[PDB]
């Protein structure tokens with residue numbers, strides 16, 4: 001019959017959105033979060049990735065705005081910036097500088113603690129949501145393996161008292177992120193292993209927070225620098241994003257085989273060694289506020305519970321626990337929002353009575369969630385699969401059934417069109433913002449746009465406007 005109590009494990013972006021949506025369809029929702037959740041925008045140990053630059057692409061932003069009206073204005077009122085693409089970015093691709101065409105998509109940029117707080121404030125206020133902070137999910141309860149498995153609840157431990165308690169539930173949602181213990185919980189119930197795809201280019205991140213030149217966060221673009229991506233060499237990248245409070249977040253990254261800064265005096269020289277040194281020129285006199293923070297969470301990985309015949313009833317997996325991506329493409333929060341939107345749109349259809357058990361509904365929900373995360377998976381995996389020394393363990397025929405040399409040729413063509421042809425840039429910006437599938441770049445429509453559109457002359461300098469150079473006090477020469 002119909003769920004009366006849902007338990008959500010984890011209260012970051014995926015779990016907070018999921019709890020909001022589930023409270024609309026289920027009598028009572030409990031949220032279990034290991035951290036204390038701050039009432040001010042502060043970093044916390046359970047989301048260490050929030051130290052690094054975050055873009056909320058228009059796909060995720062619109063889905064959050066639909067679920068939680070007013071959120072976008074609250075973010076802008078608190079200093080977030082709406083960055084139009086490509087218009088508001090100075091971007092060097094492996095094919096040249098991006099012409100700054102009038103924006104066709106956007107992303108919201110704020111410090112990740114402000115985004116998270118603003119969302120929580122909107123989403124966890126409902127009267128039928130109970131948030132248990134400083135509480136750790138320990139294992140799942142129920143039975144697994146052949147025929148009739150079901151999850152009936154969760155063992156939780158209060159971290160202040162050390163006391164463990166059994167939390168019964170009709171539906172359990174794992175939103176505990178890339179560090180989820182899900183595989184261990186499933187093995188303990190007797191559930192067989194999940195199918196999983198990996199495309200792991202060994203990407204790593206190094207980030208410093210800076211005080212920006214006054215006014216740069218409002219009147220100076222974001223800047224994104226990529227390698228010429230010589231076929232046999234690791235990629236190296238850098239981005240500088242404005243966030244609230246007149247600060248710049250600078251995130252440097254590379255793929256397997258290149259070295260990232262780990263000491264502060266190594267940071268600007270890495271940016272100096274990118275294909276164009278502009279990031280170093282911008283940061284050279286900016287005031288650093290933090291040491292270098294690192295991340296090694298850069299692999300693309302995807303679990304396929306929707307394929308497991310022995311998936312247990314009453315269990316859903318969402319967010320980074322289900323699938324996680326190379327952060328350079330910026331889709332994890334959008335993918336989290338898609339998971340919650342999909343639950344919202346499919347919950348009633350899936351749980352309609354008639355089958356006599358929760359199996360049909362659980363499996364139908366997890367199958368719809370699986371379809372919803374396909375776009376960020378195939379985008380990021382396609383972009384990473386041909387890096388030198390990339391580790392590929394995937395069954396996806398879109399990836400493993402195609403000629404590598406053909407894919408490389410396709411990719412250069414798409415990039416070359418996007419930077420200098422406005423009609424191509426619209427379609428590519430749609431895909432890069434997670435609003436059209438990667439498959440659209442192989443369509444008749446896109447190929448025709450690539451062929452028929454004008455192509456502007458190559459840019460020979462970063463396309464800053466004069467008013468922008470004035471802000472940071474640089475000279476075109």
Ligand SMILES: Cc1cc2nc3c(=O)[nH]c(=O)nc-3n(C[C@H](O)[C@H](O)[C@H](O)COP(=O)(O)OP(=O)(O)OC[C@H]3O[C@@H](n4cnc5c(N)ncnc54)[C@H](O)[C@@H]3O)c2cc1C
Pocket residue numbers: 009010011012013014015032033034035045046047049050052053054055056057135136137138175176177178179180205295297318319320321327328329330331332333334336
């Ligand atoms: C370097 C880097 C840069 C990124 N940049 C971007 C970007 O630009 N744009 C974007 O959209 N995404 C970006 N991402 C991805 C984004 O951070 C995540 O997709 C997003 O946080 C959603 O993840 P989540 O809610 O599923 O899990 P997480 O955010 O990882 O949170 C999981 C939650 O579960 C809690 N938890 C864990 N274990 C337990 C337990 N046993 N019991 C209870 N609670 C538990 C944790 O404390 C945490 O609150 C980036 C990621 C990284 C690493």
Ligand SMILES: [Cl-]
Pocket residue numbers: 048049050294295296297
């Ligand atoms: Cl991290």
